[PDB]
Design a protein around this nucleic acid. Structure first.
Lengths: 60, 63
DNA sequence: TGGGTCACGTGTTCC
DNA sequence: AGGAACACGTGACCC
């Protein structure tokens, strides 16, 4: 009966994962080294490249 | 007696999850602001906003 | 209470 | 083959 409830929960959970992934992709599109890439980079690298990129900016 | 591999794999997975959180916290500590706690998605979302915004302003400042 | 995030353990995919 | 990255569903906790 409340099996529906568990699937509801697990769906909420997938919605969040999917949102984070799209944000990760969108972030990568905004970091030139990632953008310039044929193979998609993994999520940790994208994050590392994004903070690297930000430290790059403050130096003007 | 395969607990050893499972356990090791759990350790490995946890390390990625933790590196990921560490990276998020660092992105957030870098944003113009700022008032935690943003959740992970918010950090990401606000990081995106910041770069588009910096792009716009920075471009505008010439031609 | 409802419905949300997070950490976890483990299933799945790809190289 | 098998490991690293990724996807999943669920218990603990929160507002």
């Amino acid at each position: 009966r409340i099996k529906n409830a568990r699937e509801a929960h697990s769906q909420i959970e997938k919605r969040r994962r999917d949102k984070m992934n799209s944000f990760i992709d969108e972030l990568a599109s905004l970091v030139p080294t990632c953008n310039a890439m044929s193979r998609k980079l993994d999520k940790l690298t994208v994050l590392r490249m994004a903070v690297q990129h930000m430290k790059t900016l403050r130096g003007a | 007696k395969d607990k050893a591999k499972r356990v090791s794999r759990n350790k490995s997975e946890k390390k990625r999850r933790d590196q990921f959180n560490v990276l998020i916290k660092e992105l957030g500590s870098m944003l113009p602001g700022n008032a935690r706690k943003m959740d992970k998605s918010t950090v990401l979302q606000k990081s995106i906003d910041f770069l588009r915004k910096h792009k716009e302003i920075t471009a505008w400042l010439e031609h």
